[PDB]
């Protein structure tokens, strides 16, 4: 029956997606009254296709909010006020670890000795 496919659901705006969310929370709420007052097994039984299509509208609304907010903090030099829900979640230990732009830092002498005496490729016969 009524079943929001997501391909025709990602082309909606933020206002029409909310207007069809109130449409489908309302249709679920007036099937919770037929689930308590008897209920034919055909009218009841549209409880999964509504409740999983509410889950499709909310995952289009939420994936369009993180997309339009990740492209609000990586745009410029505002990346110190980026909220931590939008940052790259790794292991806790991997965020504190030395990045590889760091950790290969070396002395002016340590650069010289790898330039004055570099490791040669060679063979033997």
């Amino acid at each position: 029956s009524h079943h929001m496919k997501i391909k025709d659901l990602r082309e909606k705006s933020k206002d029409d997606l909310l207007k069809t969310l109130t449409e489908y929370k309302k249709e679920l709420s007036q099937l919770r009254v037929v689930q308590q007052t008897g209920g034919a097994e055909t009218r009841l039984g549209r409880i999964r296709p509504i409740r999983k299509s509410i889950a499709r509208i909310l995952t289009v609304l939420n994936q369009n909010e993180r997309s339009n907010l990740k492209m609000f903090y990586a745009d410029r030099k505002l990346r110190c006020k980026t909220p931590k829900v939008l940052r790259a979640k790794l292991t806790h230990r991997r965020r504190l670890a030395l990045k590889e732009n760091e950790k290969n830092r070396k002395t002016s002498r340590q650069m010289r000795q790898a330039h004055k005496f570099p490791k040669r490729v060679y063979a033997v016969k």
């Binding site: 933020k14 909310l18 969310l21 109130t22 929370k25 309302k26 679920l28 709420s29 007036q30 919770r32 009254v33 037929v34 689930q35 308590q36 007052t37 909310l58 609304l61 939420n62 909010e65 993180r66 907010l69 006020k81 909220p83 829900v85 939008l86």
Partner: protein, 118 residues
């Protein structure tokens, strides 16, 4: 500073700056229109419930257990175009919260309960 008239040195009040308001910490939509479908769940249809619709004026619903009586009245206005004058909530031994909702005597209880359908 100067003019120390008390026997002990209490802390002088420096200038103290307010804290910045952060932009956001939640990335999730929350529709204010669907927000009262979680307050009101479904009506009861028991024998004590059917008697109170006819004889007193009241309607009976399972509501969510973490709502107060004020926000149940406001959900019985936006969902159902009726006026609640009195809500008497009750957390059941089942674990659910049941509300008895008396209408304003400008609104018929059966005319609302046919539109809901029960």
């Amino acid at each position: 500073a100067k003019s120390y008239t008390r026997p002990q040195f209490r802390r002088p009040h420096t200038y103290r700056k307010p804290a910045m308001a952060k932009p956001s910490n939640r990335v999730t939509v929350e529709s204010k229109d669907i927000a009262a479908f979680s307050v009101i769940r479904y009506p009861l249809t028991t024998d004590k419930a059917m008697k109170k619709i006819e004889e007193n004026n009241t309607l009976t619903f399972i509501v969510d257990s973490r709502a107060n009586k004020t926000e149940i009245k406001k959900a019985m206005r936006k969902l159902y175009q009726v006026k609640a004058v009195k809500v008497n909530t009750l957390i059941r031994p089942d674990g659910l919260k049941k509300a008895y909702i008396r209408l304003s005597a400008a609104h018929d209880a059966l005319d609302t309960a046919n539109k809901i359908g029960l």
